[PDB]
Design a protein around this ligand. Structure first.
Ligand SMILES: *[C@@H]1O[C@H](CO)[C@@H](O[C@@H]2O[C@H](CO)[C@@H](O)[C@H](O)[C@H]2NC(C)=O)[C@H](O)[C@H]1NC(C)=O
Ligand SMILES: *[C@@H]1O[C@H](CO)[C@@H](O)[C@H](O)[C@H]1NC(C)=O
Ligand SMILES: *[C@@H]1O[C@H](CO)[C@@H](O)[C@H](O)[C@H]1NC(C)=O
Lengths: 106, 277, 230, 228
């Protein structure tokens, strides 16, 4: 019964609006926005770069997300980085899987 | 009638989803057992590891009567019925086996004979001992067995209450009275059913690929099958060894090979057995 | 007379892209008569060894092995042996080496544990344990890096793989990086990389620092604007 | 034809609470007239030998005889001598064991690390590790006791001590334990003990629990504005 206007995945916002149906009377029925936004609370500022510090200031521009480095990982997409590896004198750069269940071989 | 009477709804606490974990549980990973020497090679299911006892964990000390003892296990049984069926509703599979396995596991926790090293199990055992009175070890074990055998009716009726809130008009199934079957045989049956379903799936894939078409994808299918059988062989070895050690003590298990014990009774597809011979 | 054959770890298979078998013979007299060709399952050989040193720190003989076997042969698991021609042994010694066949492949889980608050109260050194759980077989390769560039191998020490206490066939690996306490307090990101065959991308990475690993406080600036929306 | 003698490590004397001085014969089959004794400098052959073994095709006929002595006598470097007289060789087989001399005694600084947050997200099991480091000898015997009663040795594995890179004379040892994650959620103290000679009391306990590692304060700053 609620219309999901905007569902951005990185900001993990859920812009959805619902109307409570009133009784038999002139219309004063309440229109609501059922916005339910979720914080990671432990992710870093550069989501692709693992070597970033903790992000504390989360800026949620609600008008902007309707239509910028993004907050939480999405299981559909891959956020991957390259890490150096050494067996000796040689240095080899190998792509790594930052999050499971997203880039698993399917 | 083969149904349950209208049971009043009691407050139940939420439980974490069984499919919340991305790994979907690990059969191989076993956390705690009573002893891995006398009970070697037994595998704990994800269902037992995810067995949500939050309702009894809150009031395991404030409880002082057997009427509340029956009522509290009804509350957690309803939560398990909601959790198991919702998990299998997404999976589109029959949840009766999970319901009865969870009931039997809960009953063995009530006994204290459940093949687990939980202090929660010890706490519930001590609470039930102080409910009925303190006696010697064998006497209190036998009294707890008798009490659970007498009072399992309400718990099992709550389980089909959770079952019939969804199935509705279709008749309720029968108890099947497997409560005499211990924990490890039931875990063997659950493991066999799970691994037989996965063998059905993987064998269907490897047939549909290799038998019709050596394609690289077919070679990958054979490699996946090889990896899975290599993963599952030590589990079979340990469980069969356990069956051989505890072989002689029941009549139903007098059949010599463990695979035919799995095959001849219940909860199996009669397809594969992973014998080393 | 000491002889050892070291299987090539999966890091040697992956990073070097070449399978190099070494059957080292050390702590013995020097005769310089070493000519060893790695025998395959059949009688033929692939390649001879290279770079034999006729000196040792304790004035003895140190030998090494070298070969280039295709990776598909190792996937097949054919048995390989190293036989010695060097003249001190009256009879050649054979060390049968091969990849085990039938072993399970469980993906390892890389887990980072921050230093305890009791140790951080000392203010000299901070120890971080890279604890790996549930990999099969034992051969696991682990690295430590700071902010993207690697550390020296002396800074971090990793233990030999050991059987899991309760799991039947799994193994656990435990590695420690010892650093000064003030570096941990500055917030430098300390990361651990584990290489194994059963991983999806063969490399998975985890990062821990002061703000991530058991932080004392959660500082969050929860700002929002334009609640009217469009 | 060598009688190996095993010196009782600190783990053995700690677990069994008593001293065992043993003489194990290697590469020798079973013959009669076995004569073994444990003797010090001035000489006290005042103990008996029990549990004589049986022949083995590997010729490792033990002929083990355990000696019970005071705890401090072994720590005093008494340098006991095991002399074995047998039918094959009339000359006694003198093999000796003693407490190591000149080893520095640096006490361990045991650190108990709670399970990571990524342990508990999957809700599978809790992997508590017990970090023992700073001990200059390598005699480490670690147990786990919950609510007083010790846990089974199968739950926890104590790895062998390994050299410390930064500290040349010190060794480090880690002893992990795998326990169910819901039991961690309930809240119960897990205590790891370390046994070492250099400790002032040879016992040091650390306690881990659900509330040992927690955020002391939350600094949420909710800012809602209708302007841009
Ligand atoms: C930090 O975020 C920036 C985006 O603002 C990224 O930097 C570049 O990202 C592109 C696309 O992934 C890469 O092709 C470039 O190589 C990145 N730049 C550098 C210098 O590597 C990236 O997500 C983060 N930066 C780093 C260095 O990880
Ligand atoms: C905590 O956050 C506030 C607001 O973002 C900031 O002013 C302050 O410096 C932060 N303190 C620390 C220690 O990060
Ligand atoms: C908590 O936040 C306030 C402002 O949001 C800041 O002034 C203060 O320093 C923060 N606390 C700490 C310990 O940094």
């Amino acid at each position: 019964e609620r219309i999901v206007l905007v569902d951005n995945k990185c900001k993990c916002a859920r812009i959805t609006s619902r109307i409570i149906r009133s009784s038999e009377d002139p219309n004063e029925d309440i229109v609501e926005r059922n916005i339910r936004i979720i914080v990671p609370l432990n992710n870093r500022e550069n989501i692709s770069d693992p070597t970033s510090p903790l992000r504390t200031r989360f800026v949620y521009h609600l008008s902007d997300l309707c239509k910028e480095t993004c907050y939480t990982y999405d299981r559909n997409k891959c956020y991957t980085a390259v890490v150096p590896l050494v067996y000796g004198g040689e240095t080899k750069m190998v792509e790594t899987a930052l999050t499971p269940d997203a880039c698993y071989p399917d | 009638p083969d149904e349950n009477f209208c049971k009043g709804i009691k407050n139940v606490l939420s439980c974490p989803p069984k499919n919340s974990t991305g790994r979907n549980g690990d059969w191989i990973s076993v956390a705690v057992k009573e002893s891995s020497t006398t009970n070697k090679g037994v595998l704990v299911p994800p269902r037992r590891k995810k067995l949500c006892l939050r309702n009894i964990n809150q009031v395991w000390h404030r409880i002082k009567d057997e009427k509340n003892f029956k009522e509290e296990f009804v509350k957690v049984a309803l939560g398990e019925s909601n959790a198991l069926m919702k998990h299998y509703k997404e999976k589109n599979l029959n949840a009766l086996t999970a319901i009865k396995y969870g009931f039997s596991d809960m009953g063995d926790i009530i006994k204290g004979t459940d093949l687990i090293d939980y202090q929660i199990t010890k706490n519930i055992n001590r609470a039930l001992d102080k409910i009925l009175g303190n006696e010697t070890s064998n006497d209190k074990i036998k009294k707890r067995v008798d009490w659970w055998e007498a009072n399992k009716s309400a718990f099992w009726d709550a389980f089909m209450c959770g079952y019939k809130v969804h199935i509705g008009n279709k008749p309720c199934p029968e108890h099947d009275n497997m409560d005499r079957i211990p924990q490890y045989l039931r875990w063997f049956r659950e493991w066999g059913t799970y691994v037989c379903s996965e063998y059905k799936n993987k064998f269907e894939n490897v047939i549909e690929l290799c038998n019709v078409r050596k394609e690289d994808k077919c070679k990958g299918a054979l490699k996946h099958y090889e990896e899975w059988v290599n993963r599952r062989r030590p589990e079979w070895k340990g469980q069969c060894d356990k069956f051989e050690k505890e072989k002689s003590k029941y009549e139903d298990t007098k059949s010599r090979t463990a695979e035919i014990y799995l095959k001849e009774i219940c909860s199996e597809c009669d397809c594969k057995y992973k014998d080393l011979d | 007379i000491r002889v050892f054959a070291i299987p090539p770890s999966f890091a040697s298979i992956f990073l070097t892209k070449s399978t190099k078998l070494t059957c080292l013979v050390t702590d013995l007299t020097t005769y310089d008569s070493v000519t060893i060709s790695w025998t395959r399952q059949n009688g033929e050989a692939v390649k001879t060894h290279t770079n034999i040193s006729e000196s040792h720190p304790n004035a003895t003989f140190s030998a090494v092995g070298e070969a280039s076997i295709c990776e598909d042969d190792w996937n097949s698991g054919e048995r390989f042996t190293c036989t010695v021609t060097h003249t001190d042994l009256p009879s050649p010694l054979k060390q049968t080496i091969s990849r085990p066949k039938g072993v399970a492949l469980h993906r390892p889980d890389v887990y980072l544990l921050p230093p305890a608050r009791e140790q951080l109260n000392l203010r000299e050194s901070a120890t971080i344990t890279c604890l790996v759980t549930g990999f099969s077989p034992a051969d696991v390769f682990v690295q430590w890096m700071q902010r993207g560039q690697p550390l020296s191998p002396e800074k971090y020490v990793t233990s030999a793989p050991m059987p899991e206490p309760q799991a039947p066939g799994r193994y656990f690996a435990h590695s420690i990086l010892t650093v000064s306490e003030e570096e941990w307090n500055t917030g430098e990101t300390y990361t651990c990389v584990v290489a194994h065959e059963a991983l999806p991308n063969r490399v998975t990475e985890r990062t821990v620092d002061k703000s991530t690993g058991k932080p004392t406080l959660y500082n969050v600036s929860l700002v929002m604007s334009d609640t009217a929306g469009t």
